[model samples]
Target: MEKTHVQLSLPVLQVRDVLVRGFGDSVEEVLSEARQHLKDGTCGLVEVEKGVLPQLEQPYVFIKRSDARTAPHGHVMVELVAELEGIQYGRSGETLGVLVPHVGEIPVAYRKVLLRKN
Candidate 1:
Protein backbone atom coordinates (compact mmCIF):
# COMPACT_ATOMS: atom_id res chain seq x y z
CA MET A 1 0.00 0.00 0.00
CA GLU A 2 1.02 3.61 -0.50
CA LYS A 3 2.19 5.20 2.71
CA THR A 4 1.74 8.91 3.09
CA HIS A 5 3.93 10.76 5.56
CA VAL A 6 1.99 12.71 8.15
CA GLN A 7 3.93 15.08 10.35
CA LEU A 8 2.70 15.49 13.94
CA SER A 9 4.67 18.02 15.93
CA LEU A 10 3.83 17.07 19.48
CA PRO A 11 5.94 17.65 22.57
CA VAL A 12 6.83 14.48 24.47
CA LEU A 13 9.47 13.56 26.97
CA GLN A 14 11.43 10.34 26.70
CA VAL A 15 11.90 9.54 30.33
CA ARG A 16 11.38 6.88 32.99
CA ASP A 17 9.24 4.04 31.50
CA VAL A 18 7.24 6.15 29.10
CA LEU A 19 7.32 9.00 26.65
CA VAL A 20 5.86 11.77 28.71
CA ARG A 21 3.95 14.36 26.71
CA GLY A 22 4.96 18.02 26.52
CA PHE A 23 4.40 20.91 24.10
CA GLY A 24 4.98 21.55 20.39
CA ASP A 25 4.18 23.88 17.49
CA SER A 26 4.40 23.94 13.70
CA VAL A 27 8.15 23.47 13.52
CA GLU A 28 10.05 20.25 14.18
CA GLU A 29 12.33 19.24 17.01
CA VAL A 30 16.05 18.57 16.73
CA LEU A 31 17.13 14.97 17.42
CA SER A 32 20.86 15.34 17.87
CA GLU A 33 22.65 14.02 20.90
CA ALA A 34 25.20 16.78 20.64
CA ARG A 35 22.43 19.34 20.64
CA GLN A 36 20.32 17.31 23.03
CA HIS A 37 23.05 17.28 25.66
CA LEU A 38 20.81 19.04 28.12
CA LYS A 39 18.13 17.55 30.38
CA ASP A 40 15.59 19.31 28.21
CA GLY A 41 15.07 18.83 24.46
CA THR A 42 13.50 16.61 21.88
CA CYS A 43 15.02 13.19 21.43
CA GLY A 44 13.43 12.93 18.02
CA LEU A 45 12.19 15.31 15.39
CA VAL A 46 10.41 12.51 13.59
CA GLU A 47 8.38 12.11 10.42
CA VAL A 48 5.38 9.83 10.24
CA GLU A 49 3.77 7.82 7.45
CA LYS A 50 1.09 5.17 6.99
CA GLY A 51 3.04 1.95 6.96
CA VAL A 52 5.77 0.76 9.31
CA LEU A 53 9.13 1.79 10.65
CA PRO A 54 11.37 1.53 7.56
CA GLN A 55 14.78 3.00 8.24
CA LEU A 56 18.10 1.21 8.38
CA GLU A 57 20.68 3.83 9.40
CA GLN A 58 19.13 6.70 11.28
CA PRO A 59 21.56 8.31 13.68
CA TYR A 60 20.90 9.15 17.32
CA VAL A 61 18.46 6.27 17.11
CA PHE A 62 19.38 5.36 20.67
CA ILE A 63 20.13 1.70 21.25
CA LYS A 64 20.62 -0.09 24.53
CA ARG A 65 24.32 0.36 25.12
CA SER A 66 24.49 -3.29 26.20
CA ASP A 67 27.58 -2.23 28.07
CA ALA A 68 25.85 0.34 30.24
CA ARG A 69 29.28 1.11 31.58
CA THR A 70 30.35 2.51 28.23
CA ALA A 71 27.58 4.59 26.68
CA PRO A 72 24.36 6.12 27.97
CA HIS A 73 20.87 5.33 26.75
CA GLY A 74 18.36 8.04 25.82
CA HIS A 75 14.90 8.64 27.35
CA VAL A 76 16.54 10.21 30.35
CA MET A 77 16.02 13.59 28.77
CA VAL A 78 14.18 15.38 25.98
CA GLU A 79 10.68 14.91 24.61
CA LEU A 80 9.61 13.09 21.46
CA VAL A 81 6.44 11.72 19.95
CA ALA A 82 5.41 9.50 17.02
CA GLU A 83 2.68 10.45 14.61
CA LEU A 84 2.31 7.13 12.90
CA GLU A 85 -0.49 6.44 10.47
CA GLY A 86 -2.86 5.26 13.18
CA ILE A 87 -1.01 3.62 16.05
CA GLN A 88 1.17 5.29 18.68
CA TYR A 89 4.26 3.77 20.29
CA GLY A 90 6.19 4.51 23.47
CA ARG A 91 9.79 4.47 24.59
CA SER A 92 11.90 4.81 27.70
CA GLY A 93 15.24 3.97 29.34
CA GLU A 94 14.21 0.42 28.56
CA THR A 95 13.08 -0.03 24.95
CA LEU A 96 14.76 2.43 22.63
CA GLY A 97 12.58 3.49 19.73
CA VAL A 98 9.75 1.38 21.08
CA LEU A 99 7.37 4.07 19.89
CA VAL A 100 3.80 3.08 19.21
CA PRO A 101 3.23 0.74 16.25
CA HIS A 102 1.19 3.47 14.64
CA VAL A 103 2.55 2.43 11.26
CA GLY A 104 4.83 5.07 9.76
CA GLU A 105 7.68 5.41 7.34
CA ILE A 106 10.98 4.53 8.94
CA PRO A 107 13.65 7.17 9.35
CA VAL A 108 15.65 7.93 6.24
CA ALA A 109 18.93 9.65 5.33
CA TYR A 110 20.00 12.15 7.93
CA ARG A 111 23.78 11.86 8.09
CA LYS A 112 24.57 11.31 4.42
CA VAL A 113 27.80 9.47 5.22
CA LEU A 114 25.87 7.33 7.68
CA LEU A 115 22.76 6.36 5.67
CA ARG A 116 21.72 6.11 2.03
CA LYS A 117 18.92 8.41 0.78
CA ASN A 118 16.86 5.73 -0.87
Candidate 2:
Protein backbone atom coordinates (compact mmCIF):
# COMPACT_ATOMS: atom_id res chain seq x y z
CA MET A 1 0.00 0.00 0.00
CA GLU A 2 1.18 3.52 -0.76
CA LYS A 3 0.21 6.84 0.78
CA THR A 4 -1.40 9.30 -1.60
CA HIS A 5 -0.35 12.94 -1.45
CA VAL A 6 -2.67 15.76 -2.43
CA GLN A 7 -1.61 19.00 -4.06
CA LEU A 8 -3.24 22.27 -3.02
CA SER A 9 -2.98 25.25 -5.44
CA LEU A 10 -5.44 27.74 -4.08
CA PRO A 11 -5.84 30.46 -1.43
CA VAL A 12 -8.00 29.91 1.65
CA LEU A 13 -9.62 32.42 4.03
CA GLN A 14 -11.72 32.17 7.20
CA VAL A 15 -13.47 34.27 9.87
CA ARG A 16 -14.29 33.85 13.56
CA ASP A 17 -17.73 33.65 15.16
CA VAL A 18 -17.75 36.48 17.74
CA LEU A 19 -20.05 38.65 15.67
CA VAL A 20 -19.98 42.35 16.50
CA ARG A 21 -23.22 44.19 15.94
CA GLY A 22 -23.51 47.94 15.61
CA PHE A 23 -26.60 50.05 16.16
CA GLY A 24 -25.27 53.38 14.85
CA ASP A 25 -21.55 53.08 15.33
CA SER A 26 -18.88 52.46 12.71
CA VAL A 27 -18.30 48.82 11.92
CA GLU A 28 -14.62 49.68 11.72
CA GLU A 29 -14.38 48.89 15.41
CA VAL A 30 -15.35 45.31 14.73
CA LEU A 31 -12.68 45.00 12.08
CA SER A 32 -10.22 46.67 14.41
CA GLU A 33 -10.79 44.01 17.05
CA ALA A 34 -10.38 41.20 14.56
CA ARG A 35 -7.18 42.71 13.21
CA GLN A 36 -5.86 43.00 16.77
CA HIS A 37 -6.37 39.32 17.35
CA LEU A 38 -4.56 38.46 14.13
CA LYS A 39 -1.72 40.82 14.95
CA ASP A 40 -1.41 39.24 18.41
CA GLY A 41 -0.40 35.92 16.88
CA THR A 42 -3.95 34.68 16.59
CA CYS A 43 -4.25 32.18 13.78
CA GLY A 44 -7.12 32.55 11.37
CA LEU A 45 -8.63 29.53 9.66
CA VAL A 46 -9.46 29.23 5.96
CA GLU A 47 -13.12 30.05 5.40
CA VAL A 48 -13.30 30.74 1.67
CA GLU A 49 -11.08 29.75 -1.21
CA LYS A 50 -10.86 32.04 -4.20
CA GLY A 51 -9.41 29.13 -6.13
CA VAL A 52 -7.34 29.74 -9.25
CA LEU A 53 -8.91 32.77 -10.84
CA PRO A 54 -8.21 33.88 -14.39
CA GLN A 55 -5.19 36.13 -15.04
CA LEU A 56 -4.00 35.67 -11.48
CA GLU A 57 -0.76 33.75 -11.25
CA GLN A 58 -1.69 32.80 -7.70
CA PRO A 59 -4.86 32.61 -5.62
CA TYR A 60 -5.90 35.24 -3.05
CA VAL A 61 -7.34 34.70 0.45
CA PHE A 62 -10.08 36.92 1.75
CA ILE A 63 -10.58 37.34 5.52
CA LYS A 64 -14.07 38.71 5.93
CA ARG A 65 -15.88 40.67 8.64
CA SER A 66 -19.57 40.65 7.75
CA ASP A 67 -22.27 43.02 8.93
CA ALA A 68 -25.98 43.33 8.37
CA ARG A 69 -28.23 46.38 8.09
CA THR A 70 -31.72 46.00 9.50
CA ALA A 71 -34.77 48.16 9.09
CA PRO A 72 -36.87 49.47 11.96
CA HIS A 73 -39.73 47.24 10.84
CA GLY A 74 -37.28 44.36 10.52
CA HIS A 75 -38.78 43.51 7.17
CA VAL A 76 -35.72 44.25 5.11
CA MET A 77 -32.13 43.28 5.67
CA VAL A 78 -28.90 44.02 3.87
CA GLU A 79 -25.46 42.58 4.29
CA LEU A 80 -22.01 44.14 3.91
CA VAL A 81 -18.82 42.22 3.37
CA ALA A 82 -15.47 43.48 4.61
CA GLU A 83 -12.41 41.49 3.71
CA LEU A 84 -8.65 41.87 3.94
CA GLU A 85 -5.53 39.96 2.97
CA GLY A 86 -3.37 39.39 6.04
CA ILE A 87 -0.52 37.10 5.09
CA GLN A 88 0.66 34.93 2.24
CA TYR A 89 2.58 31.77 2.96
CA GLY A 90 4.18 29.77 0.22
CA ARG A 91 3.67 26.06 -0.31
CA SER A 92 7.10 25.53 1.20
CA GLY A 93 5.84 26.46 4.69
CA GLU A 94 7.74 29.71 4.55
CA THR A 95 5.72 32.84 5.30
CA LEU A 96 7.81 34.84 2.86
CA GLY A 97 8.04 33.44 -0.66
CA VAL A 98 6.56 33.71 -4.13
CA LEU A 99 4.07 31.15 -5.45
CA VAL A 100 5.07 30.07 -8.90
CA PRO A 101 2.33 28.18 -10.65
CA HIS A 102 3.09 24.51 -11.32
CA VAL A 103 6.78 25.16 -10.68
CA GLY A 104 7.10 25.85 -6.96
CA GLU A 105 6.52 22.94 -4.61
CA ILE A 106 3.77 22.79 -2.02
CA PRO A 107 4.64 22.96 1.67
CA VAL A 108 3.56 21.06 4.78
CA ALA A 109 2.12 24.23 6.31
CA TYR A 110 -0.75 24.02 3.83
CA ARG A 111 -2.02 20.91 5.54
CA LYS A 112 -1.20 22.17 9.01
CA VAL A 113 -3.45 25.23 8.67
CA LEU A 114 -7.16 24.60 9.24
CA LEU A 115 -10.13 26.81 8.42
CA ARG A 116 -13.18 27.12 10.67
CA LYS A 117 -16.70 28.47 10.00
CA ASN A 118 -18.97 29.26 12.92
Candidate 3:
Protein backbone atom coordinates (compact mmCIF):
# COMPACT_ATOMS: atom_id res chain seq x y z
CA MET A 1 0.00 0.00 0.00
CA GLU A 2 1.34 3.45 -0.92
CA LYS A 3 -0.02 6.88 -0.12
CA THR A 4 0.95 10.37 -1.31
CA HIS A 5 3.49 12.09 0.95
CA VAL A 6 1.87 15.49 0.71
CA GLN A 7 -1.65 15.90 2.05
CA LEU A 8 -3.89 17.90 -0.28
CA SER A 9 -5.46 19.93 2.49
CA LEU A 10 -4.13 21.00 5.85
CA PRO A 11 -5.78 23.32 8.30
CA VAL A 12 -4.27 26.81 8.36
CA LEU A 13 -2.81 28.05 11.60
CA GLN A 14 -2.58 31.63 12.84
CA VAL A 15 -0.96 33.46 15.72
CA ARG A 16 -3.20 35.45 18.06
CA ASP A 17 -0.63 36.58 20.61
CA VAL A 18 3.10 37.18 21.09
CA LEU A 19 5.21 36.61 24.16
CA VAL A 20 8.76 37.85 24.43
CA ARG A 21 10.86 36.86 27.43
CA GLY A 22 13.81 39.04 28.40
CA PHE A 23 16.50 38.83 31.02
CA GLY A 24 18.76 41.08 33.16
CA ASP A 25 18.74 44.57 34.74
CA SER A 26 17.07 46.22 31.75
CA VAL A 27 13.74 44.43 32.05
CA GLU A 28 11.77 47.58 32.81
CA GLU A 29 13.55 49.52 30.06
CA VAL A 30 12.68 46.88 27.50
CA LEU A 31 9.10 46.76 28.73
CA SER A 32 8.79 50.54 28.26
CA GLU A 33 9.96 50.24 24.68
CA ALA A 34 7.46 47.48 23.97
CA ARG A 35 4.74 49.52 25.61
CA GLN A 36 5.17 52.09 22.83
CA HIS A 37 3.20 49.70 20.63
CA LEU A 38 0.36 49.53 23.14
CA LYS A 39 -2.93 51.37 22.62
CA ASP A 40 -6.26 51.66 24.44
CA GLY A 41 -7.78 48.26 25.37
CA THR A 42 -4.48 46.55 24.63
CA CYS A 43 -2.68 44.67 27.40
CA GLY A 44 0.98 44.17 28.30
CA LEU A 45 3.22 41.33 29.53
CA VAL A 46 3.91 40.10 32.99
CA GLU A 47 6.94 38.94 34.99
CA VAL A 48 7.19 35.18 35.12
CA GLU A 49 9.43 33.10 37.36
CA LYS A 50 13.14 33.77 36.89
CA GLY A 51 13.81 30.05 36.60
CA VAL A 52 12.09 30.07 33.17
CA LEU A 53 15.53 30.83 31.79
CA PRO A 54 18.27 28.80 33.44
CA GLN A 55 21.17 31.25 33.07
CA LEU A 56 19.21 34.30 34.18
CA GLU A 57 18.15 34.70 37.80
CA GLN A 58 15.80 37.61 37.03
CA PRO A 59 13.88 37.80 33.77
CA TYR A 60 10.68 39.30 32.31
CA VAL A 61 8.15 38.29 29.70
CA PHE A 62 6.18 40.67 27.45
CA ILE A 63 2.86 39.31 26.23
CA LYS A 64 1.55 41.11 23.14
CA ARG A 65 -1.70 40.42 21.34
CA SER A 66 -2.30 40.34 17.59
CA ASP A 67 -4.57 38.97 14.91
CA ALA A 68 -4.98 38.56 11.12
CA ARG A 69 -6.73 41.93 10.96
CA THR A 70 -3.48 43.79 11.82
CA ALA A 71 -0.58 41.47 11.27
CA PRO A 72 2.79 43.24 11.20
CA HIS A 73 4.35 43.81 7.79
CA GLY A 74 7.85 43.56 9.22
CA HIS A 75 9.05 40.25 10.76
CA VAL A 76 8.28 38.09 13.72
CA MET A 77 8.80 34.61 15.11
CA VAL A 78 6.28 31.97 16.14
CA GLU A 79 7.70 30.07 19.09
CA LEU A 80 6.39 28.07 22.03
CA VAL A 81 6.42 29.29 25.61
CA ALA A 82 6.77 26.95 28.59
CA GLU A 83 3.47 26.23 30.30
CA LEU A 84 2.76 28.11 33.53
CA GLU A 85 1.83 24.90 35.30
CA GLY A 86 3.42 21.61 34.31
CA ILE A 87 0.31 19.52 33.92
CA GLN A 88 0.57 16.17 32.23
CA TYR A 89 -2.10 15.37 29.70
CA GLY A 90 -4.44 12.54 30.53
CA ARG A 91 -3.89 9.05 29.40
CA SER A 92 -5.95 9.00 32.62
CA GLY A 93 -4.78 10.89 35.68
CA GLU A 94 -5.67 13.81 37.98
CA THR A 95 -3.64 16.58 39.60
CA LEU A 96 -3.77 20.25 40.42
CA GLY A 97 -1.79 23.43 41.09
CA VAL A 98 -2.30 27.18 41.36
CA LEU A 99 -4.31 28.36 38.36
CA VAL A 100 -2.49 30.70 35.98
CA PRO A 101 -3.38 33.10 33.20
CA HIS A 102 -4.87 31.23 30.22
CA VAL A 103 -2.86 33.19 27.66
CA GLY A 104 0.34 32.91 29.69
CA GLU A 105 -0.14 29.20 30.16
CA ILE A 106 -0.81 28.55 26.51
CA PRO A 107 2.57 27.29 25.28
CA VAL A 108 1.09 26.20 21.95
CA ALA A 109 2.78 29.32 20.43
CA TYR A 110 3.34 33.11 20.17
CA ARG A 111 4.51 35.89 17.83
CA LYS A 112 7.48 38.17 18.52
CA VAL A 113 9.87 40.71 16.96
CA LEU A 114 13.49 41.09 17.91
CA LEU A 115 14.65 44.22 19.73
CA ARG A 116 18.44 43.96 19.87
CA LYS A 117 21.27 42.02 18.28
CA ASN A 118 21.99 39.20 20.63
For candidate 3, list the clashing residue pairs, or say none. Answer: 45-63
Candidate maximizing TM-score: 2
The lDDT per prediction is: 0.26, 0.26, 0.26
- Residue lDDT tens for model 2, 1-116: 32122112232222222121111222343334433433343323332334322222223322322223322242222112232243332122212111121212222333222211
lDDT of 3 by residue, 24-45 (tens): 2344543343333222213223
| Model 1 agreement with the true structure over 20-70: per-residue lDDT tens digits | 221222112322332232223232323333322343122223221122332
Better of 2 and 3 by TM-score: 2
Q: Poorest 10 consecutive residues of model 3 by lDDT?
A: 4-13
| CA-only RMSD, every prediction | 15.7, 20.0, 17.5
Count of backbone clashes for each model? 10, 4, 1
* TM-score per candidate: 0.20, 0.23, 0.22
Give the Cα error of residue 102 in candidate 3, in Å.
30
